[PDB]
C-alpha cells in the first residue's frame, strides 16, 4: 500500500550504476590539486591586492 | 567623491532610527504562552484581550505575549529561540485527572521543559486551570484520586496551608496534593537560578493580569538581587 510505493521507491534506488572509490578519490584529488593556486584563503595574497587591508 | 557623501546621510539616518528603536525594544517584556491540550489557553488569552501575538499595558508597563499553538509538534526544536524571554506561562487542566492519563502527560511535559539545556535560567508561572470542575468531581464523586494516583490515600493537607472561605476539607486536600506534585519537580533541580509560581485560576476570574505583573516584578527583583551576591 503506502508500503507499495515504499517498495517501489526503494526498488528504484537499487537500479543504479556505481564506480569504484579509487576513481572518485583520484578525481577529487585531481580537482583540488588543479585549483590549488587560485584561492586566497590557502595561499595568502600580497597585502596590496587585499581589499580589506 | 560624491559616493561617500551620499552614503554618509544614509548611515546617519539608519543609526538614528536604530538609536530611537533601542528604547522601545528595551522597554517591553516578552512572555511565552505554552499549555497542554484542552487546557484552556484560548479563554485565558481572550480574557487578557501559525503564530499569535498580543500586546497589552498595565501601570505604564508593556507586555507582549506569544502563543505557539500553530506548530504544535511532538518534537520541539523551535524552543531554542525562546531562551531570552522573561517568563514562561504554563496552563494545565487540573480537573482532567482521569480522562484519556492526561495529568501524567502534563507532568512529563513540565519535567521535560524544566530540564531543557537552553531554558536553564527561565522561570515558570503556572496556572492550575478549571478549578470548579475539580470541586464538582471531588464533592460526592464516583471517581476519586487514590484510584488513579495511589499516593493520595495517605496524604493529608498541610497544617500551615490556608484554605479559602467555605471550602470543604476534601477539596483543599486534593487541590494541595495536585500542587505538591508540580513543586516537587521544580525543587529537585532548581539550584537557585529559576523558580516556580503556582496559582489557582478559573475561567471567570479576571485578576490574573495582576498576578502576571507581580510575578514578573518578583522575577526581575530576584535576578538583580542574585547578580550582586545578596541572595
Amino acid at each position: 500500500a503506502q508500503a507499495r510505493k515504499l517498495v517501489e521507491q526503494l526498488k528504484m534506488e537499487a537500479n543504479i550504476d556505481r564506480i569504484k572509490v579509487s576513481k572518485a578519490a583520484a578525481d577529487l584529488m585531481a580537482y583540488c590539486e588543479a585549483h590549488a593556486k587560485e584561492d586566497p584563503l590557502l595561499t595568502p595574497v600580497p597585502a596590496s591586492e587585499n581589499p580589506f587591508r | 567623491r560624491n559616493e561617500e557623501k551620499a552614503q554618509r546621510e544614509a548611515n546617519k539616518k539608519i543609526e538614528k532610527q536604530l538609536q530611537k528603536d533601542k528604547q522601545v525594544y528595551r522597554a517591553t517584556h516578552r512572555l511565552l504562552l505554552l499549555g497542554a491540550g484542552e487546557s484552556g489557553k484560548s479563554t485565558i488569552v481572550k480574557q487578557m484581550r501559525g503564530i499569535f501575538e498580543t500586546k497589552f499595558q498595565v501601570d505604564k508597563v508593556n507586555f507582549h505575549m506569544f502563543d505557539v499553538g500553530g506548530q504544535r509538534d511532538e518534537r520541539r526544536k523551535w524552543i531554542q529561540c525562546f531562551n531570552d524571554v522573561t517568563a514562561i506561562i504554563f496552563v494545565v487542566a487540573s480537573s482532567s485527572y482521569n480522562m484519556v492519563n492526561r495529568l501524567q502527560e502534563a507532568l512529563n511535559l513540565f519535567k521535560s521543559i524544566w530540564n531543557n539545556r537552553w531554558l536553564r535560567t527561565i522561570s515558570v508561572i503556572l496556572f492550575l486551570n478549571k478549578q470548579d470542575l475539580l470541586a464538582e468531581k471531588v464533592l460526592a464523586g464516583k471517581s476519586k484520586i487514590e484510584d488513579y494516583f495511589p499516593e493520595f490515600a495517605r496524604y493529608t493537607t498541610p497544617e500551615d496551608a490556608t484554605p479559602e472561605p467555605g471550602e470543604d476539607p476534601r477539596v483543599t486536600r486534593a487541590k494541595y496534593f495536585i500542587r505538591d506534585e508540580f513543586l516537587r519537580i521544580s525543587t529537585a533541580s532548581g539550584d537557585g537560578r529559576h523558580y516556580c509560581y503556582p496559582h489557582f485560576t478559573c475561567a471567570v476570574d479576571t485578576e490574573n493580569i495582576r498576578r502576571v505583573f507581580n510575578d514578573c516584578r518578583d522575577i526581575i527583583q530576584r535576578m538583580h538581587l542574585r547578580q550582586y551576591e545578596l541572595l
Binding site: - | 528604547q23 513543586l183 521544580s186 518578583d218 527583583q221 530576584r222 538583580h224 538581587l225 550582586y228 541572595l231
Partner: protein, 284 residues
C-alpha cells in the same frame, strides 16, 4: 630602621598601581565588560591610580627625608591634588550605592532612569564638585591659618605642613565624608529590607521541601570603608576645636591609614566571575 618603613611604602605603591592598572586594562580591552555600572568603577579606579601615582610617593619621600626639598608651589600643588583625590574617591562609592538602590528597589524603571548618556554627566559633575573644593580654596589663600607657627612655617621653603582654619577644616569634612556616609547607610538599609522580604517569600512558598550572604556582603562593604576613613575625619574636626588635644604623629598615622583604602577597592568591587575570566586571559 628607616629602611623597613621604606621597604613597606614601596610595596604599598606597587600594589596600588598594579591592581588599578590591571582593572582598567581588563575593562578597556574586552567588549563584554562594558556596562552602565562599569563606568563608575573605572572612574574610581582612575582616581585611585592618580592618588597612588601622585601623593603616596612624594609623601613617603618627605617623611623619609624629613625635609621638603622642592618649592612652595610644588607642595601646594601636592596638597591640592591629594585633597582632590581623597574627596573624589568617596562620592563615587555613594553613586555606586545609589545605582544599586535603583536597580534593586525599582526594577522596571532602571532601564529608563539610568542610560549611557546620564552616566557621563553624573561622573563629570562629581569630578567637577570634587575639584571645586580642592583647587579653589587652596590655590587661592582662603584656607591659610593665622597663628604664629603657621605663618612662620609658610615663608620657609624647607618644610611644608598642613595648617588650616576652622571653616575649611569643617567644610571639607562635611563635603567629603559625612554626606556620602548617611546616604550609603540609608541606601543599604533599604536594600537589606528588600532581601529579607524576598527570603521570607521564598521560604513561605517552598520551605517544606528544602540571611547570611547579604549580611556578609553588606558587612564587608560598609566595614572596610568605615574602618579605613572614619577615624581620620574625627581627629580632623577635633584638632581645630581643641588646641592641644591631638599631637602631630597621631594625625599623620591616621591619614596614612586612610590612604590604604585605595588598595582594597579592586578586591571588593571586582569579584564577579566575568571579571575573573577577563583577568585570566589578560594575565595568561
Amino acid at each position: 630602621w628607616v629602611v623597613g618603613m621604606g621597604i613597606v611604602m614601596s610595596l604599598i605603591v606597587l600594589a596600588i598601581v598594579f591592581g588599578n592598572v590591571l582593572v582598567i586594562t581588563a575593562i578597556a580591552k574586552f567588549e563584554r565588560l562594558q556596562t552602565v555600572t562599569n563606568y563608575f568603577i573605572t572612574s574610581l579606579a582612575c582616581a585611585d591610580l592618580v592618588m597612588g601615582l601622585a601623593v603616596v610617593p612624594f609623601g613617603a619621600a618627605h617623611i623619609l627625608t624629613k625635609t621638603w626639598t622642592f618649592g612652595n608651589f610644588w607642595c601646594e600643588f601636592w596638597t591640592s591634588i591629594d585633597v582632590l583625590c581623597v574627596t573624589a574617591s568617596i562620592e563615587t562609592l555613594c553613586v555606586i550605592a545609589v545605582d544599586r538602590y535603583f536597580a534593586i528597589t525599582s526594577p522596571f524603571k532602571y532601564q529608563s532612569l539610568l542610560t549611557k548618556n546620564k552616566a557621563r554627566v553624573i561622573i563629570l559633575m562629581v569630578w567637577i564638585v570634587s575639584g571645586l573644593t580642592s583647587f579653589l580654596p587652596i590655590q587661592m589663600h582662603w584656607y591659610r591659618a593665622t597663628h604664629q607657627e603657621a605663618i612662620n612655617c609658610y615663608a620657609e621653603e624647607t618644610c611644608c605642613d598642613f595648617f588650616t582654619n576652622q571653616a575649611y577644616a569643617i567644610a571639607s569634612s562635611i563635603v567629603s565624608f559625612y554626606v556620602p556616609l548617611v546616604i550609603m547607610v540609608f541606601v543599604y538599609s533599604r536594600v537589606f529590607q528588600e532581601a529579607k522580604r524576598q527570603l521570607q517569600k521564598i521560604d513561605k512558598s517552598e520551605g517544606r521541601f528544602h540571611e547570611h550572604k547579604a549580611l556578609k556582603t553588606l558587612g564587608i562593604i560598609m566595614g572596610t570603608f568605615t574602618l579605613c576613613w572614619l577615624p581620620f575625619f574625627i581627629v580632623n574636626i577635633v584638632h581645630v576645636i581643641q588646641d592641644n588635644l591631638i599631637r602631630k604623629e597621631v594625625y599623620i598615622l591616621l591619614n596614612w591609614i586612610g590612604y590604604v583604602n585605595s588598595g582594597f577597592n579592586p578586591l571588593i568591587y571586582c569579584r564577579s566571575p566575568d571579571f575573573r575570566i577577563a583577568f585570566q586571559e589578560l594575565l595568561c
